[PDB]
Amino acid sequence: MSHYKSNVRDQVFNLFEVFGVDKVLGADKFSDLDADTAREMLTEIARLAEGPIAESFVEGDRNPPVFDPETHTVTLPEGFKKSMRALFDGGWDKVGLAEHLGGIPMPRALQWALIEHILGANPAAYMYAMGPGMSEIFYNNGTDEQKKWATIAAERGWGATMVLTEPDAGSDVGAGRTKAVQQPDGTWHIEGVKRFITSADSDDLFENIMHLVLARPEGAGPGTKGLSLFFVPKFHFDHETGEIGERNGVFVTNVEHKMGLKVSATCELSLGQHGIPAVGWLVGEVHNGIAQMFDVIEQARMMVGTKAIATLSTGYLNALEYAKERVQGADMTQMTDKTAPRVTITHHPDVRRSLMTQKAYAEGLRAIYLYTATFQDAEVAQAVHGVDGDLAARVNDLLLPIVKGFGSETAYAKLTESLQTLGGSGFLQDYPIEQYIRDSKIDSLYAGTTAIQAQDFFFRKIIRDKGQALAYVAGEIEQFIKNGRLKTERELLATALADVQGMAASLTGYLMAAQEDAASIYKVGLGSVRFLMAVGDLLSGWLLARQAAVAIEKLDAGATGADKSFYEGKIAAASFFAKNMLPLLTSTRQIIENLDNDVMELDEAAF
Amino acid sequence: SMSHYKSNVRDQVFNLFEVFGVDKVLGADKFSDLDADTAREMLTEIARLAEGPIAESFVEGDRNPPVFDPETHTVTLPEGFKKSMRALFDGGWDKVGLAEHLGGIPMPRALQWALIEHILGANPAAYMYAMGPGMSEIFYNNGTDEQKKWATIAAERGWGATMVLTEPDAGSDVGAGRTKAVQQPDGTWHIEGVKRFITSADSDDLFENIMHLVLARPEGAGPGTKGLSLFFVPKFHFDHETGEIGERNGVFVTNVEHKMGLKVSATCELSLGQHGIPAVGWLVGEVHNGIAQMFDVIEQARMMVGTKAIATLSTGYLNALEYAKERVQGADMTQMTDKTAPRVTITHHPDVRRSLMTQKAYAEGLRAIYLYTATFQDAEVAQAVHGVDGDLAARVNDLLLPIVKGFGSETAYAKLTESLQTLGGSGFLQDYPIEQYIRDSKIDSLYAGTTAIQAQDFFFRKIIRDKGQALAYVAGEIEQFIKNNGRLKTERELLATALADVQGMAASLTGYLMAAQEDAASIYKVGLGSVRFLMAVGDLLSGWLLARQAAVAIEKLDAGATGADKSFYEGKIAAASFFAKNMLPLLTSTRQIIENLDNDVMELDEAAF
Ligand SMILES: Cc1cc2nc3c(=O)[nH]c(=O)nc-3n(C[C@H](O)[C@H](O)[C@H](O)COP(=O)(O)OP(=O)(O)OC[C@H]3O[C@@H](n4cnc5c(N)ncnc54)[C@H](O)[C@@H]3O)c2cc1C
C-alpha cells in the first residue's frame, strides 16, 4: 500500500472505551450522528488518507511547488492537486464545520481523530483545506454583512491564510509594522510585507483566497493591543452573489525552499506594493485584532501538535512492519554460537526497547490530544468529565501548549528511533521516515516556537489562571493513583505527580521572588521548557495507565484474538513508560530546584 | 549558506596544548622535526582552506548531487565539489598522518584528527573521498613485501579506496556475507557477489584508480566472520612495477542510492564478477584473516564518523550563536509586562542562553573526548601525556572508540535540534546550513556500525572481555580529579555522583550477565540497558573533561588573562558548571532505571506491538 499506516483501532479505543465520547453521540447537538456512523467515518477517511492522499506524499517533496514571477502565483505538482480534489470531492474540508455552513455536527474529539489521517498521509493537504474552517472563524467574529460573505466563502470552498509574521515580527507579533489606512468608504488599504505565509498562493486549487491579515491602523497604539484584523481577499467579489471580480492588491513575491513540508507553499506576501491597493475589511468592524486572531492560532496549534503525533504514529508503524521482516543476527541468548539460527530483529532487546519507546510515546500522545479535544465541546466535557463550560475552556487552554509543544518535540525526537530501526535503509529516500523527520522539524517552530509554548503554559495557562485548570488535572491523576497488577505503575505515577508539583512550586517561587529581585524571573525562563515537557510525560504516563486499566478489564472479561493482542500491548506500554520514562522527572525536578543565574550573567563574548 | 563552515582552532589548540600537553612530544623522537609552532600553523592553514575552497561546494554537493550512468557504471560529480577535492589534494591534506615512507608528515594522532575536523566540518564527504592514502597505509601494514610495493604506488599516486563489507542480508551481521572467493592456479582469486551501500565505489575522475578492500568467503571456508578473508580488488589492473594503469577489472557499480543527506558521497551497489569479466583479488598479506584485517579499517572509520558528527555540531553551534547575537526579537524578561520596553537580541532570553550553553558544552565536551581518545592512539603520546604503557593505551583507545562513535553520533544529531531551533522559522530554511547539518549527520548513528552495535561492543568486548582494565584506568583518573581551590567544589560533588552512577550501571549490567549463567534470558537486560549505559559514560566523560578544562581556565584567569583570552576562559568555567548541574544529575535516574530492567518487553507477543 502507501507510506501511510493508520490506526483507527487505537482511535476508536480512545474515543469509546477510554473517554466515552460515544455517550454524547445521538443526543442534543450530535442528535444525527450515532457511534456506528462515527466509526464508519473514521474508517472511510483512513482509507482516503492511505489511498489518494498518501499517493502524492513523495511527489510533493520530490517535485516541489514553483513560484512564477511572471504572474506572482505558485504552481503545484499535478499529483498533489489530484489528492486535493479527492479531499474536496469527499467533503472532507467540511470536517467540523458548523451545520449552517454545510458541515456535519460532531464532537471535536471525533473531528480531530478524522483530521489525524490527513495529517499522517500528506499534512500539507489539510493545511490547504483549512479554508472553510477559517471562514467559520470569520463568520463568528464578523458583522451581519460579513457573515454573509463568510457563508459564500465556505459554500464555494475558498482557501484561506493567517497572516501575522513579518521579517522583524515573529514570536513578537506586537512589533509588526504593516499599516492600515481607512478609506472614505469605510474600507482600509493594507500596506506592508508579511513573511512565511502558508498557502499564500495555491495554483488553481480555489477560485479565491481569504487572507486574514493583522495590521496596525494609523494612530493606533503599540504592541499586539494596537493590532486589528482585516479580511483581505485575493480577488474582489460581489458581496451578494459571490461572483469573482477584479484582482485585489495582495501578491506572493517568493516561495521559500524548506527542509521539508515542501509541497506547502510558504510565501512572502506583499500588500499594496504592486500598483493596486490591498483592500481590507475590518473584521467585526471592531479593533480587537490579536484576540480575534487567536481564535485561529488556537486551532493552528492544535493542528500542529496533532500533525506531529500523526507523523510519529505512521513512522512507528512503518518501523514496526520493517522490523517484523528484517532478518539480522542470532538471538542474544545464542550470541557466542556463530552458527545459531538467524532471527528477525524484533528479537533483539535494543530493537524491542526502541519499538516500545515509539509505541508508548505515539499512543500516549494520541491519548493526550484526544483527551484535550474532549474539553473543546461544553456538552462533551459535561457528559464525559462532569465539568462545566468555564472549567472545560481553561483545561483545554492549559492543554493546547502541551499538544503543540510537547507533541512537536516528542514526535521529532522519537522518529529518530523509527529511522534507527531500519538500519542503513532508514537513511534512504526509498522509505518514508527521512521525509517524516524533515516534514516534522517545522512543528516546533511555526504556530509559536516551543519556548513560546512553555511561556504561555506557565505564565498564562497556570499563573494567570491561578492554577485552577492545573489543579483539576492533578486531581484526576491523584484519583487514579488512589484507586493490583497496576500497583507499581500507580506508585511511579505518584512520584511523577509529586515531581511535577515540585517543579511548579520552584518556578512559582522564582516568579514571585522577582518582585524584589528582578533577575529571579530568568530562572522561570531557564526551567520553563523542561517543565512543559515533564507535564507531557506525566500526562502520557497517566493516560497510558488509564488505558491499561481498561485493557485489564477487557481481558478479564474474556477478550480474544486481535483484541487480546491489542489489550496486552496497552498493559505492556503503560508499564514500560512508567518504569523507563517517568523516573527521569525526579532528576529534572532537582535540576529545576537548583537553577541559578550564572548563565544569564556570563558575557555574551564567552559563548 | 556558502561560507557555512565556522571553525574553532582556538578550542583545538587549548585542548592540544593547555589541557593535554600534546606539545610535550612535538620535537622529540618520532615527531622530532615538527614543533609546536608548525602544528599551530597547520591548524590555521587547513581551517582557512576548509572555510574557503572546501566549504564552497557544501551546498552544491547536496543540491546538485551525483548522477549515475548505468551503462558506463560511473558517477558524475558536480564540478564545484571536484574543485574542492583538488584544493584538498593540492595542499597534501589527503596525506595527514600518513607514514613518512608513504609521503606523510609524522605527527601525533591528536593533531591529525584536529586537522581533519576542519574538512569534516566544511564538507565531510570530501574527506571520505580522500581516505585512499590512509587505506594504502593500512594495506601496507597488513600486506606482503610485494603488496607493500603496490601500497607505496597507490599512496604516491593518491588512489581512492573503499571498504567493501555490506550485503543486503549482511549489515550488522557481517559474518552472514555470501560474496565468494574462487582460488586460481596462479594464486590470485576471483571475487563473485553483490555488495551494497559502498561509499565512494565510484568517484568520477577524481582518481586514476580505486583500491576496493573486499571481504569475501573462500570457497569451502567456515561460516561467520572467522571464515572471511580480505582481498585487494583494484578498479583497474595496473603494472605492479611502475603503477601504470591497465585494463578494467571486473568490479562495477550497478546502483547509487538516493539518501536523506550526505548526498555528494556516492553510496553504491557494487557487483563483483557479474558482467562476464572476473573481479581479480589478491589475498591481503597472503593470509586468511579477513575480519581482523578489516577491523584496522573499521577502527579508523568509527573514529572518523564520531569526529564527523562532532565537527558538524560545532559549526552548527557557531552558526546558531552568530545568528542569536544579531537577531532582535522581544523584550527582556525583566520587562515582559511593559509592552513599550526596548527590544533585545535573543541572547538575552533565558531559553536561548540555555539552548546555546547546551550546544556549547556538548560541542566542546565532545571535542575534548575525541582529542582525549587520540592521545591514547600513539604509544609515545600516551606515555608522555598520561604515563601509560603501550598495552594499556591500546585498551583505553579501544574502550573510547564506541564512545566517540556511538555517543558522538547520537549527541551531535540531537543537539543540532537546539541549533536549528535558535534560528526560529529561518532554521527550517535551506538558506541556512543547519537543516543540511541535520540531514548529513543522521547517517552517523548508522554506518560504521549502529549505535546498538557500538554499545554491544563497548560492554562485551571493551569492558567484560577486557576484564575492566581500561574502564578502571579511566574511572581512576576521574576519581583523582574529584579528590584534588574550592571554586569547583560543587562540580566535583556532581562528578562524584555521576561517577558512582556509572559504576552502578556497570555493576547491574555485569550482574545481569552473571545471572545469565543460570537463566539465559537474563542477558536480554544487558541488551535493554546497553545504549543508555554507553550514553551515560559519554556524559560522565563530557562532564569530567569540561571540568578539567575549567580548572585550567581558572589558572589562566588567576594568572591575569585579558580580552578574548579572558572571555574564552570564562566560557569554559560556565560550560563545566552548566553541564554538571543540568546534564549529569539525570544519570542518577538512569542508574535506577537500569537497576529495575525486566524482561516484560521481551516476553510480550510480537502481535501486541
Ligand atoms: C514553514 C513555516 C510556515 C509559516 N507559516 C506562517 C503562516 O501561515 N502565518 C504566519 O503568520 N506565520 C507563519 N510562519 C511564521 C512562524 O510562526 C514563525 O517562524 C515563528 O512564530 C517564530 O518566529 P521567528 O521565525 O521570527 O523566530 P524568532 O521569533 O526570531 O525566534 C528565534 C529564537 O528566539 C527565541 N525567542 C524569541 N522570542 C523569545 C522570548 N520572548 N523568550 C524566549 N525565547 C524567545 C525563539 O524560541 C527561537 O528559538 C511560518 C513559519 C514557517 C517556518
Ligand SMILES: Cc1cc2nc3c(=O)[nH]c(=O)nc-3n(C[C@H](O)[C@H](O)[C@H](O)COP(=O)(O)OP(=O)(O)OC[C@H]3O[C@@H](n4cnc5c(N)ncnc54)[C@H](O)[C@@H]3O)c2cc1C
Ligand atoms: C550512507 C551509508 C554508507 C555506507 N557505506 C558503507 C561502506 O562504505 N562499506 C560498508 O561495508 N558498508 C557501508 N554501509 C553499510 C552500513 O554500515 C550498514 O547499514 C550498517 O552496518 C547497518 O546494517 P544494515 O543497514 O543492514 O541494518 P541492520 O543490520 O538490518 O539493522 C537494523 C536494525 O536492527 C538492529 N540490530 C541488528 N543486529 C542487531 C543485534 N545483533 N543486536 C541488536 N540490534 C541489532 C540495528 O541496530 C538496527 O537498529 C553504509 C551504509 C550507509 C547508510
